[PDB]
Design a protein around this nucleic acid. Structure first.
Ligand SMILES: Nc1ncnc2c1ncn2[C@@H]1O[C@H](COP(=O)(O)OP(=O)(O)O)[C@@H](O)[C@H]1O
Ligand code: ALF
Ligand SMILES: [Mg+2]
Length: 984
RNA sequence: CCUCUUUCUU
């Protein structure tokens, strides 16, 4: 009873790099520190999810007078005790790394190992001989175990051995967007001549074009147009300008146009290249479309957009590019020469990329004075941001386009006469710290309203209440599209089916319910902007993509559930969990601003007024909770200095323990050298839009000739979309989808096979592809995004220099009962690309993660079954470990013990009774000399990655020792390599 | 609605 959960959460990995501080002593050390320093602040707890899937966030902030910095922590857990232990561990690690407290000198109490039985593996004599030959050819040192047989129950014996981003004023024959010398004819004219041509063309358009006249007349009626003159003056004078105006006032649409028009009418038209960064792909594309439309032209002339897998570049001079923050971050590697203005929208999101860009822009403004940076947002602490930018003007745009009327939960209940159903309490009648805000209300509201308020729940979303609100919206008889904000896919599509069952909402002739998710098909993502036939009301159930920056021309109603879905990550146990938490006031009012832009609207907030007053202003920055190795790589790539200095200069500096963990991770994976400089491998991985470990397996697979399979699998493991779709009541995968893995019993193999057939059906035709995906229970969006990311990875690998002759698409036959060389080597590199997610199967769904911690097989895995089935091998490598009511393993792929030892392993130790211990929990019964011989190949393989990254062009023509190493690694990677003489 | 899928990565 949840004891396995308790141990799995209390399990710790990275205590070694944090001064040997663990959960088992962290609370005691924190308590002693608080007693010594007279700090009496207690933990703060936040319930998560409905009453069954209850988790907690533990928050504790401690102020140190010595360092004059408040050191905060925010950690999650299945219960209050676990959450508080994780919080105390992170806080103690932070205090240790700030040199406030000391490293641990004591020792823990008991381990309770209970090791599992050893696993037998035998190699063929010729296989051992070729391993020895490869070792001798590669001069690999070996560890003879015959001289160290002293493992008498004691410790096991190991058996293995400051620059600023470039900027310059506009220049002739230079493409700002591509960052390349045009050096191409007839555009080699003078920049002054281009400016004069722009001025003449805009004058002619303003004098003749009736559509342009009408659009300028509309633009002159926006609230930002009133302050246009002061905005232009402040932009021209000050280097950094903060523009704070209400949502829809016209910031993104109008500021860049104002700057460009001023420059062009001044005769300097070719001296204005403006970058506008949006936080969402949909927002960037839509705003670029709108600006180009009201400029009475087409995309690519003066307005362009640039997002992932989509770019319509503008003319090289006198133009605006509407990109995402990540696109600009990637573009910064080539510099920002010829960029006159950089305009950043919605700086309130506090995302990791936005904070990164803010730091970069601050240094760039400090260095170059002619570069102008504009930060526009509707909901920001202007004082905090101006203090960050060394005191800058804040221009407050007043008024608003149209009014928006906001109602709360009590108002909604009063207006719709809502009453919760009896079965709602019946489900909780079997179950039955009271900080509930649904029981806090004013005396103006009716007694029945208060009773319904108390009867409702805060962490539960009421579909009946949503349906009643939608019925009342229908009753008021007002045209307009309804935007419903929901935390995630599950709730969005559950509400979709719920509404489609009802006759009132299931009829397409009256309603058209559209999803709005980042993982729905990209053409369907545009279906939320196109209009609908008369007599049909558009209902958009959306995530936070629609929250900001976008304008649907017929949005009149915005229903808000007020919950934000966040991806938690507890680093000390590598547990990743998703939590539906309460949204902030910033998010609430940004979502409210979706209406009242083209015409007056309404906002329906499904939370209590007391709950709204209890809401935080801005959500916790993603810096405080995300890993930092990606930005560590990016800082190294852009040559921005030290990681510690760069994140100290951040708006809110991230936790020092997280920074240290990212640095240690990137050092161990060898993306940096001893001097913390970027290695060629690190640079190649930095240019890749995947996790550095997946990029390392990318390079390795390219060396081994399976780059196509490595690409498809790394793309699959890099996305949160799901390959297999479960129907209503589908607790497990269906037989046809389980068959796609054949006898390989691998989610990755099932992915590859499904993509292989889906590619053929896509070539045959779109309708046939849709029929195939429906037949096989796949996701079109998942397949297409996996293909797009894998193609991007392959193209980037080509741009690096790797030959095309290492990326041939090798077809996979999942029905092969036996050995498949390419597939086996790919599944083996999976262990390196997913370390340390290795689990051993006990029985049914019961598996053990590292240190023999309990876990369950995910319901959507091919290896999950209710029957007590056995597997050809008890070892699996999974993608991510998910924290739920239990601990689950997701995206599993059965691997052989040889593959585990070769790739999913860092330390090899010889234990007592001639058993080798790997990862301190996996037992194998082999020859210790053979274990040392196999483990000696890991440094050789690392050197192979190094030489491949040094010279990507000649990886397919390697030296003789390295070719021998590749061949012997493939031979070891075959499935039955270690099954010599074993019944298995 | 008794949770497979917040967002972003020239
Ligand atoms: N795609 C669009 N369709 C119709 N009108 C739009 C569109 N985008 C913007 N607008 C108009 O522009 C105004 C909002 O400008 P916007 O760029 O949203 O400013 P901000 O970025 O400050 O919210 C609204 O009044 C709206 O009428
Ligand atoms: F940029 Al907004 F509402 F603030 F579209
Ligand atoms: Mg906008």
């Amino acid at each position: 009873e949840q004891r396995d959960m308790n141990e799995a959460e209390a399990f710790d990995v990275n205590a070694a790099i944090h001064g040997n501080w663990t959960i088992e002593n962290a609370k005691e050390r924190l308590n002693i520190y608080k007693q010594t320093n007279n700090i009496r602040d207690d933990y703060k707890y936040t319930p998560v999810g409905p009453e069954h899937a209850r988790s907690f966030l533990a928050e504790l902030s401690i102020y140190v007078p010595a360092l004059n910095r408040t050191v905060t922590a925010r950690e999650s857990g299945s219960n209050k005790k676990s959450a508080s232990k994780s919080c105390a561990l992170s806080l103690v690690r932070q205090l240790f790394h700030l040199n406030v407290i000391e490293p641990f000198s004591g020792t823990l109490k008991k381990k309770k190992d209970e090791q599992l039985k050893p696993y037998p593996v035998k190699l063929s004599p010729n296989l051992i001989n070729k391993i020895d030959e490869v070792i001798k050819g590669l001069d690999l040192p070996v560890v003879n175990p015959r001289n160290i047989k002293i493992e008498l129950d004691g410790p096991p014996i190991p058996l293995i051995v400051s620059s600023v981003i470039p900027w310059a004023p506009p220049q002739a024959n230079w493409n700002t967007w591509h960052a390349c010398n045009i050096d191409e004819g007839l555009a080699t004219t003078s920049i002054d001549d281009l400016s004069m041509d722009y001025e003449r063309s805009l004058r002619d358009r303003r004098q003749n074009d009736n559509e342009y006249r009408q659009f300028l007349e509309f633009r002159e009626k926006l609230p930002i147009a009133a302050m246009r003159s002061e905005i232009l003056t402040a932009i021209n004078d000050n280097p950094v300008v903060i523009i704070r105006g209400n949502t829809g006032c016209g910031k993104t649409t109008q500021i860049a146009q104002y700057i460009l028009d001023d420059y062009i009418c001044s005769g300097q038209g070719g001296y204005a290249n403006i970058y506008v960064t949006q936080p969402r792909r949909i927002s960037a594309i839509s705003v670029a479309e709108r600006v180009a439309r009201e400029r009475c032209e087409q995309l690519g002339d003066t307005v362009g957009y640039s997002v992932r897998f989509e770019s319509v570049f503008p003319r090289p001079y006198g133009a605006i590019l509407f990109c995402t923050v990540g696109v600009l971050l990637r573009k910064l590697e080539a510099g920002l020469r010829g960029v006159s203005h950089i305009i950043v929208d919605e700086i309130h999101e506090r995302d990791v990329n936005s904070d990164f860009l803010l730091v970069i822009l601050r240094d760039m403004v400090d260095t170059y004075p002619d570069l102008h940076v504009i930060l526009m947002s509707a909901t920001i602490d202007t004082t905090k941001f101006s203090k960050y930018f060394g005191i800058c003007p804040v221009l407050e745009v007043p008024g608003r386009a149209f009014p928006v009327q906001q109602f709360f939960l009590e108002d909604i209940i009063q207006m719709t006469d809502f009453v919760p159903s009896a079965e709602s309490r019946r489900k909780r009648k079997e179950v039955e710290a009271e900080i509930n805000y649904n029981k806090v209300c004013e005396d103006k509201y009716s007694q029945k309203t208060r009773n319904a308020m108390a009867m409702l729940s805060e962490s539960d979303v009421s579909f009946e209440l949503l349906e009643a609100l939608l019925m009342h919206i229908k009753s008021k008889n007002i045209p307009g599209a309804i935007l419903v904000f929901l935390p995630g896919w599950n709730l969005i599509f559950a509400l979709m089916k719920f509404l489609q069952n009802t006759n009132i909402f299931g009829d397409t002739s009256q309603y058209q319910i559209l999803p709005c998710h980042s993982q729905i098909p990209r053409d369907e993502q545009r279906k939320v902007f196109e209009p609908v036939p008369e007599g049909v009301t558009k209902i958009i159930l959306s995530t936070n993509i629609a929250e900001t920056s976008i304008t649907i021309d017929d949005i009149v109603f915005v229903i808000d559930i007020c919950k934000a879905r966040m991806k938690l990550f507890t680093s000390h146990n590598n547990l990743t969990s998703y939590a539906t938490v309460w949204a902030s006031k910033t998010n609430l009012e940004q979502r409210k601003g979706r209406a009242g832009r083209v015409r007056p609207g309404f906002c329906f907030t499904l939370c209590s007024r007391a709950r709204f007053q209890a809401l935080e202003d801005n959500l916790t920055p993603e810096m405080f909770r995300t890993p930092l190795h990606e930005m560590a790589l990016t800082i190294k790539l852009l040559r921005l200095g030290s990681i510690h200095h760069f994140l100290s200069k951040a708006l809110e500096p991230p936790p020092v323990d997280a920074v240290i963990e990212a640095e240690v991770l990137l050092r161990e994976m060898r993306c940096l050298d001893a001097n913390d400089e970027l290695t060629p491998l690190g640079r190649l991985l930095a240019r890749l839009p995947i996790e550095p470990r997946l990029g390392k397996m990318m390079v390795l697979g390219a060396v081994f000739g399976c780059a196509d399979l490595m690409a498809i699998m790394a793309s699959y493991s890099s996305t949160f979309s799901e390959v297999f779709s479960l129907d209503i009541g589908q607790r497990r995968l269906a037989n046809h989808q389980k068959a796609l893995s054949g006898t390989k019993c691998s989610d990755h193999v099932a992915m590859i096979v499904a993509s292989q057939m889906w590619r053929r059906e896509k070539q045959r035709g779109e309708h046939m592809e849709a029929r195939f995906c429906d037949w096989k229970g796949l996701q079109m969006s998942t397949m297409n995004v996996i293909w797009d990311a894998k193609q991007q990875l392959l193209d980037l690998l080509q741009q690096a220099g790797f030959p095309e002759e290492c990326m041939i698409s090798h077809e996979v036959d999942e029905r092969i009962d036996g050995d498949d060389p390419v597939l086996d080597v790919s599944l083996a590199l999976l262990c390196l690309g997913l370390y340390p997610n290795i689990c051993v199967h006990k029985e049914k769904r019961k598996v053990l993660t590292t240190e023999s911690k309990a876990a369950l097989l995910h319901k959507t895995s091919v290896n999950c079954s209710n029957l007590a089935v056995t597997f050809p091998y008890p070892f699996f490598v999974f993608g991510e470990k998910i924290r739920t009511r239990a601990v689950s393993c997701k995206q599993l792929s059965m691997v052989s013990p040889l593959q585990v030892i070769l790739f999913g392993s860092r330390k090899i130790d010889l234990a007592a009774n001639n058993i080798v211990r790997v990862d301190n929990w996996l037992n194998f019964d082999i020859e210790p000399e053979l274990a040392a011989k196999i483990g000696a190949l890991k440094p050789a393989l690392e050197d192979l990655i190094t030489v491949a990254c040094d010279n990507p062009s000649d990886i397919l023509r390697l030296e003789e020792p390295y070719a021998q190493l590749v061949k012997v690694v493939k031979d070891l990677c075959v499935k039955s390599a270690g099954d010599f003489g074993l019944q298995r």
